[PDB]
Amino acid sequence: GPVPSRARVYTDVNTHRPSEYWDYESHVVEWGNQDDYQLVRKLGRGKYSEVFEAINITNNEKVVVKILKPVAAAKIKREIKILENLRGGPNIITLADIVKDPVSRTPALVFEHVNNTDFKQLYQTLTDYDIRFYMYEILKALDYCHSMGIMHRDVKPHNVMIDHEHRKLRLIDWGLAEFYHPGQEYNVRVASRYFKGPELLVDYQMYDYSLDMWSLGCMLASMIFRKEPFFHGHDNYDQLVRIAKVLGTEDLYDYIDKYNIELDPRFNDILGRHSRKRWERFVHSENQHLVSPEALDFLDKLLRYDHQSRLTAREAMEHPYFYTVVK
Numbered sequence: 001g002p003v004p005s006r007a008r009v010y011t012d013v014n015t016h017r018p019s020e021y022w023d024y025e026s027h028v029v030e031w032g033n034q035d036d037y038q039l040v041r042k043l044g045r046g047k048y049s050e051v052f053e054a055i056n057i058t059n060n061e062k063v064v065v066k067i068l069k070p071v072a073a074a075k076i077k078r079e080i081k082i083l084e085n086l087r088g089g090p091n092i093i094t095l096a097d098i099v100k101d102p103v104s105r106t107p108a109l110v111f112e113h114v115n116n117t118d119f120k121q122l123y124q125t126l127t128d129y130d131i132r133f134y135m136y137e138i139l140k141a142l143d144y145c146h147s148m149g150i151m152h153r154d155v156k157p158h159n160v161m162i163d164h165e166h167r168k169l170r171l172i173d174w175g176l177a178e179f180y181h182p183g184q185e186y187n188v189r190v191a192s193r194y195f196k197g198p199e200l201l202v203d204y205q206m207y208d209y210s211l212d213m214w215s216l217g218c219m220l221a222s223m224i225f226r227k228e229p230f231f232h233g234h235d236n237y238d239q240l241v242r243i244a245k246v247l248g249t250e251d252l253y254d255y256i257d258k259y260n261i262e263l264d265p266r267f268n269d270i271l272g273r274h275s276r277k278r279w280e281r282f283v284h285s286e287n288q289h290l291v292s293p294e295a296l297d298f299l300d301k302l303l304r305y306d307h308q309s310r311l312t313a314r315e316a317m318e319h320p321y322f323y324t325v326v327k
């Protein structure tokens with residue numbers, strides 16, 4: 001069968017903890033007052049929740065209320081526990097309350113509001129300096145949650161709220177986050193298609209924090225090359241072919257050989273043979289101002305098939321790409 005794997009950092013953080021920290025099913029939810037919140041407008045709806053802009057009538061502050069659908073209502077304790085564990089951490093969204101919605105009869109999570117700009121408009125305006133600055137801010141959130149024994153598992157532009165006017169960032173939507181336990185086999189049906197790491201695409205279940213670093217590399221490549229998304233798969237199978245057209249098939253086969261993974265035979269007729277492309281292939285007159293030797297080297301060290309080879313969040317923060325960012 002497959003060769004096992006472990007994180008190279010923060011490996012044993014959860015085993016030292018009292019079970020209270022990570023045994024989310026044993027957690028007793030403290031409920032707030034639903035009447036403190038007045039819903040203002042519906043912001044969105046997904047398969048797992050309905051999201052509303054609301055006002056906290058006790059302090060007249062704007063908040064966001066995520067009312068969980070019955071399908072997400074099952075693993076609510078995991079999201080609550082993770083949000084409470086990470087509360088106050090750098091660039092982590094603050095969970096302000098947990099109330100019972102009177103209409104849905106399901107839990108409603110109340111978060112602080114962030115004045116975000118949709119990435120489809122915002123990413124087009126970012127300068128080279130801004131991409132470095134905001135990437136460093138995301139890394140602070142990722143190193144914090146990883147150091148706390150938690151993988152986000154859904155890093156993508158829609159889950160990074162940026163108040164560009166105030167140069168403030170928050171990492172949101174912890175509904176897919178999970179506690180890392182060495183040797184644990186996890187569900188590969190996590191993250192969004194274009195941000196899924198090769199470990200998920202080849203059905204390797206013993207993954208870790210490094211999944212988030214692949215997703216972050218996908219965001220970086222889209223930002224510096226002005227190509228949204230960078231790996232534009234039509235489905236989860238074509239997603240791996242798109243990756244292989246850039247990183248090459250030889251390193252893909254070495255990755256699966258190292259972990260003794262057997263690729264789904266449906267890849268035999270679609271993967272082909274591709275060499276690794278040099279990152280300069282993606283540079284053109286319209287994105288050249290966002291590209292530097294440091295950006296390319298940093299990206300090259302995130303976008304690796306082997307999850308164990310990728311930079312950790314703390315190693316990423318040490319990279320020369322961030323030397324120009326004021327700290």
Ligand SMILES: Nc1ncnc2c1ncn2[C@@H]1O[C@H](COP(=O)(O)OP(=O)(O)OP(=O)(O)O)[C@@H](O)[C@H]1O
Pocket residue numbers: 043044045046049051064093111112113114115116158159161172173
């Ligand atoms: N804390 C928050 N502050 C402000 N806006 C928020 C906050 N949390 C979520 N939102 C906004 O709520 C809206 C609906 O959220 P939702 O997750 O359902 O959709 P989405 O952002 O398009 O994500 P997805 O790509 O996963 O479908 C989005 O416009 C999102 O930016």
